[PDB]
Design a protein around this ligand. Structure first.
Ligand SMILES: COc1cccc2[nH]c(C(=O)N[C@@H](CC(C)C)C(=O)N[C@@H](C[C@@H]3CCNC3=O)C(=O)COP(=O)(O)O)cc12
Ligand SMILES: COc1cccc2[nH]c(C(=O)N[C@@H](CC(C)C)C(=O)N[C@@H](C[C@@H]3CCNC3=O)C(=O)COP(=O)(O)O)cc12
Lengths: 299, 297
């Protein structure tokens, strides 16, 4: 079958801490001797526009409390970097994993460790959508929850949770302190752009259906990538690219991309009660990488 | 959003178990390694006489690796469809834990492992036909299923086989195969799956709490009439209306209006969608819905 999976969370869980500042609690990420967390933790009043330079100048280090498991950490300094704080603590996290920082591109998959009061509660896989929001599941207290990927024996930290938009979509920042999509960490309504279905993930899904033997939707007609891309601009799908990446899948099946792009056009009107790998409409959750790892064990 | 509970406490308990040329995953708790008994079978190709395989077992064929260390086997005994392998070494990362057998409908977490190393983690439900909708390939056997609850890890599932349908079957850690399936290379057909009605009701209450209510009408379907419709339409009977009384009280919507909606929505969504789903969804339990939206267990 095909299940949306998270990569294991163990390396990340040892780094999550609780960050208290005055009348606000949220989550931080403890790496080396730095704790990363959203800068709005220091905002005393969030019922009007937040002047972060003012909040920063009145900040006093003795109002911080940072808790790892049951241990308090000594706070030594704190600097502001975009929409994040970098808090210097007197102790090094001896469980700091091998890691780097990376900024997600449009459509890329990653993992969210949903944390509360400095303790992890759930983990799930998710895609950065073309409108720079994610479909998460967060309630109050989740700010500072980290997003990550495991690659080559290294943790890549990619997302720090920040805000929930009026529509229910979730916005975070990189650990550089740049908010995805340019959203503001301000208490006021902001509207995101319309979402686009990720065409390359729908193609990979349809290959998966072929390999699992679900072929009823498959015809023999081809739709040229260029003709599809004009249709996608008018129907809320991203353009097609990287057809060469689908070599692996096209070989094992003997079906070409341009036949599936035809199918994408047809199946956008509904599955008519039929179900493809157990879904009743097109799914853009799965990348080529995931299909290929889950079906064949090849990275 | 479907999620899993975090895996850190379980990851340190998974080991790589090799017997001869067969490799799979074991669970290291205390001084015992638990794993599927087919690790000692000579030919996973034809019928297996496990009493014979156990009698010719030779313990020096074992190799058990946790990270970089080798564990020393001192004995092994066979219980149901599992092996309990006693080693010299006690797992110093053993979490507070118990073993529990899942009932029909219950959700749990799977840590999919290969060669003794965790690769992914996802939530599942034990279906009424005693299979789960998983994702596994060769090498996944022994992958553990777990729940985190009341400051301890409950271990509930050991992965064992893929049915010809693609559905997946495991055992509890007392050696009892869920569904009574056999750990043999023969085609076995599970019974027909049923949609879990309590989970579908949980989902519609989730929809109401998020202001998704186009489908909601005023008509009421009494539980006994629904259950008659259910037995003939591949749905489970309505039960445990107790936790739903709480949701009914908060939303003002009685369960009987949702049972009616199920009967109607079963014939398709008419184009529209519910929480982004294009058809009835029974993947979420009432606990998951309450935990995710209100933060309470
Ligand atoms: C009137 O203004 C609005 C209008 C319409 C929509 C709006 N949306 C936000 C927003 O997103 N506000 C951030 C803080 C900003 C103002 C600095 C926030 O609330 N984040 C949560 C996680 C959120 C909470 C529920 N689900 C989550 O993902 C934290 O965890 C961190 O802070 P808190 O734990 O709540 O104290 C303000 C707002
Ligand atoms: C040929 O007759 C059949 C007919 C129809 C359906 C059938 N199904 C099986 C089966 O499932 N067989 C068990 C081995 C038992 C019988 C001893 C198995 O293959 N288990 C996998 C997990 C599986 C592997 C693929 N996806 C998974 O979930 C392990 O992990 C251990 O095996 P490996 O050492 O890793 O290959 C045999 C069979």
């Amino acid at each position: 079958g095909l299940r949306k999976m998270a990569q294991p969370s163990g390396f990340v869980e040892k780094c999550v801490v609780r960050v208290c500042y005055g009348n606000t609690v949220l989550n931080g990420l403890w790496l080396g001797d730095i704790v990363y967390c959203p800068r709005h933790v220091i905002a005393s009043n969030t019922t009007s526009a937040i002047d972060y330079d003012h909040e920063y100048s009145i900040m006093r280090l003795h109002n911080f409390s940072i808790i790892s498991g049951t241990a308090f950490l000594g706070v030594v300094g704190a600097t502001m970097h975009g929409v994040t704080l970098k808090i210097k603590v007197s102790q090094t996290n001896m469980h700091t994993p091998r890691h780097s920082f990376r900024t997600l591109k449009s459509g890329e998959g990653f993992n969210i460790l949903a944390c509360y009061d400095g303790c992890a509660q759930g983990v799930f896989g998710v895609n950065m959508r073309t409108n720079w929001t994610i479909r998460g599941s967060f309630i109050n207290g989740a700010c500072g929850s980290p997003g990550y990927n495991l690659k080559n024996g290294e943790v890549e930290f990619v997302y720090m949770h920040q805000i929930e938009l009026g529509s229910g979509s979730h916005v975070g920042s990189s650990f550089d302190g740049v908010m995805y999509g340019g959203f503001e960490d301000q208490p006021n309504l902001q509207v995101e752009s319309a979402n686009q279905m990720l065409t390359v993930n729908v193609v990979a899904f349809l290959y998966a259906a072929i390999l699992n033997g679900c072929t009823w939707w498959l015809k023999g007609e081809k739709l040229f990538v260029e003709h599809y891309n004009e249709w996608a601009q008018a129907n809320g799908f991203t353009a097609m690219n990287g057809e060469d990446a689908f070599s692996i899948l096209a070989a094992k099946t003997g079906v070409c991309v341009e036949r599936l792009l035809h199918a994408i056009q047809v199946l956008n009107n509904g599955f008519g009660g039929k179900q493809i790998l157990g879904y009743s409409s097109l799914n853009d959750e799965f990348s080529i990488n995931e299909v290929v790892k889950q079906m064949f064990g090849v990275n």
